[PDB]
Amino acid sequence: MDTRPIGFLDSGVGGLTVVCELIRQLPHEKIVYIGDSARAPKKQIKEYTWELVNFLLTQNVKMIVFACNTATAVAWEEVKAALDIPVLGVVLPGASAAIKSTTKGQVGVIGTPMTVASDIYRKKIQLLAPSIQVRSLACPKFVPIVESNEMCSSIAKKIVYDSLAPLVGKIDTLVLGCTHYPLLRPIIQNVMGPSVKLIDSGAECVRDISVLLNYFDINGNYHQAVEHRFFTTANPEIFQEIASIWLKQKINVEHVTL
Amino acid sequence: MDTRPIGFLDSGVGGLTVVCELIRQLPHEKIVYIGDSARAPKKQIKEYTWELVNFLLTQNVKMIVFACNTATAVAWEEVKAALDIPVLGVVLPGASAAIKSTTKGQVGVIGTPMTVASDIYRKKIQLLAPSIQVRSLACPKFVPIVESNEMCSSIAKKIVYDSLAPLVGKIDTLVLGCTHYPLLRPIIQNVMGPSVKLIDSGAECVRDISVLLNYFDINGNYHQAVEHRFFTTANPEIFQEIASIWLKQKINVEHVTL
Ligand SMILES: N[C@H](C[C@H](Cc1ccc2ccccc2c1)C(=O)O)C(=O)O
Numbered sequence: 263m264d265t266r267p268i269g270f271l272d273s274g275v276g277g278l279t280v281v282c283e284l285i286r287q288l289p290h291e292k293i294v295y296i297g298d299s300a301r302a303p304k305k306q307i308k309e310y311t312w313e314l315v316n317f318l319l320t321q322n323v324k325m326i327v328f329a330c331n332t333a334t335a336v337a338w339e340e341v342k343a344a345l346d347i348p349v350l351g352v353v354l355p356g357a358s359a360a361i362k363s364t365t366k367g368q369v370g371v372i373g374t375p376m377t378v379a380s381d382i383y384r385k386k387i388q389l390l391a392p393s394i395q396v397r398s399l400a401c402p403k404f405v406p407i408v409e410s411n412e413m414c415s416s417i418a419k420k421i422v423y424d425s426l427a428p429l430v431g432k433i434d435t436l437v438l439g440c441t442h443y444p445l446l447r448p449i450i451q452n453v454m455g456p457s458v459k460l461i462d463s464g465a466e467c468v469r470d471i472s473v474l475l476n477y478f479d480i481n482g483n484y485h486q487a488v489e490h491r492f493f494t495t496a497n498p499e500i501f502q503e504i505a506s507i508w509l510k511q512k513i514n515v516e517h518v519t520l
Numbered sequence: 521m522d523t524r525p526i527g528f529l530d531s532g533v534g535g536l537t538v539v540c541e542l543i544r545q546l547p548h549e550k551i552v553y554i555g556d557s558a559r560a561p562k563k564q565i566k567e568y569t570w571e572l573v574n575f576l577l578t579q580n581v582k583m584i585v586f587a588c589n590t591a592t593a594v595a596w597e598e599v600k601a602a603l604d605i606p607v608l609g610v611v612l613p614g615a616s617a618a619i620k621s622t623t624k625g626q627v628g629v630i631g632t633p634m635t636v637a638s639d640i641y642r643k644k645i646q647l648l649a650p651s652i653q654v655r656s657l658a659c660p661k662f663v664p665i666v667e668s669n670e671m672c673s674s675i676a677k678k679i680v681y682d683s684l685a686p687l688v689g690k691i692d693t694l695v696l697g698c699t700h701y702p703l704l705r706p707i708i709q710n711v712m713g714p715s716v717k718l719i720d721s722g723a724e725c726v727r728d729i730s731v732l733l734n735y736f737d738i739n740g741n742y743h744q745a746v747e748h749r750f751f752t753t754a755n756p757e758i759f760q761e762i763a764s765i766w767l768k769q770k771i772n773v774e775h776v777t778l
């Protein structure tokens with residue numbers, strides 16, 4: 263019965279992969295997505311996140327999903343306990359998925375410099391499972407390559423190659439700790455080898471959403487969505503581009519100023 | 521960090537399959553299981569369930585799982601909204617799993633006479649997804665066959681055969697709507713044919729538990745369980761038997777009188 267949309271707060275266009283996963287897994291659910299392209303330390307990030315949470319709230323969402331790994335690591339738990347509606351991040355489900363797929367216990371997590379600096383993935387993994395060895399590594403060149411949509415670029419494959427070098431042959435499972443990275447998946451697989459299982463946090467988060475939607479009895483109509491709404495705090499046009507390619511369809515973005 | 525056990529309230533020994541699923545999927549979690557073998561209408565079942573909930577509560581559980589389809593259908597939602605700790609049933613996750621696996625939209629759910637009379641599975645399936653055709657059918661001879669542990673019995677296979685006749689070739693997916701039935705799985709598959717996907721509610725419930733344990737940040741120690749405790753309101757010895765076979769190990773049952 264609940265026709266209210268699920269809200270997504272991202273730091274830019276990265277979270278959009280989480281969205282493509284939702285549309286893929288729960289075609290009937292409606293979406294409210296706000297990506298704070300503009301703006302860019304920690305305490306300051308909480309403030310920014312809250313601004314985006316309040317907006318999602320004024321959009322009557324039944325749920326809020328932190329599609330941003332950094333935001334999750336900094337405010338997720340706080341915002342989660344301060345609201346009555348469900349709030350989940352992409353970090354925990356990716357860590358839990360990794361914990362369960364590790365064969366030897368040597369886990370590698372890559373991601374944004376800030377996500378890695380927050381060291382959230384390590385702290386969660388070794389909190390639920392202390393014995394597992396976690397190896398984190400920032401890949402600052404990955405995000406720019408994705409937004410360029412030049413993944414097949416042999417120039418890109420080199421960056422992926424050189425960037426992962428430090429982890430090659432040292433881990434049994436690698437966590438794509440940035441929602442941008444699922445677009446570099448094939449390349450990442452090759453560079454690591456078929457012996458390394460890759461965990462897509464965003465995708466693992468969507469699989470958690472259905473379970474949560476059930477548990478809190480707030481599902482939408484399974485046979486009916488189309489009323490999707492996207493908000494960005496800057497670069498509305500470049501946003502439409504990237505978003506229209508990943509979601510394979512032109513989408514209407516609305517320039518917002520919180 | 522949460523070392524509190526997960527509580528299981530069953531109507532007898534059936535729920536034990538849900539337990540074997542937990543032990544299988546989350547070996548580290550601890551268990552408190554109460555099966556009300558004694559006692560046996562609707563309003564009266566709520567009272568009985570509550571008695572078992574209060575007991576589980578006096579056992580300091582961090583979660584309560586209705587391992588009984590009938591109890592779930594009658595009190596789950598009530599007890600769930602009256603407690604601060606998480607409470608999930610086996611019905612919803614089995615219905616949601618069926619909704620998602622149905623190819624044509626012709627779903628068949630079997631189970632206990634009471635579960636079927638409650639018509640809970642139909643109501644939930646056509647509530648979340650109105651267009652799906654749901655065909656329910658009581659198999660009162662199934663439970664007795666399982667407790668006898670004579671499944672390979674050609675006499676049993678006949679009962680399974682004749683009991684499912686009404687659904688054969690009329691559904692694309694069949695829901696094992698009784699926690700007892702997973703033990704008759706092979707037989708049930710043959711009688712339906714490889715074109716029918718079977719949904720094991722109990723198993724689908726356990727897969728939901730991990731997601732919930734995460735969400736409510738109440739996981740136990742992943743590397744440590746052994747402190748499992750079983751309580752039955754009658755027939756403690758016959759209980760030890762059945763339980764020791766399904767769980768492949770002698771287990772200590774405690775005769776309780778709520
Ligand atoms: N996800 C990266 C940017 C983030 C930075 C960032 C992290 C959190 C934010 C929260 C609210 C508004 C803006 C934010 C920006 C990162 O490097 O981890 C990107 O989309 O380029």
Ligand SMILES: N[C@H](C[C@H](Cc1ccc2ccccc2c1)C(=O)O)C(=O)O
Nearest residue numbers: 531532534556568569590591632634635
């Ligand atoms: N699960 C069946 C018994 C149940 C009956 C039943 C249903 C709910 C109960 C709740 C509390 C105490 C006893 C109960 C007994 C059924 O037929 O659906 C069995 O184990 O034989």
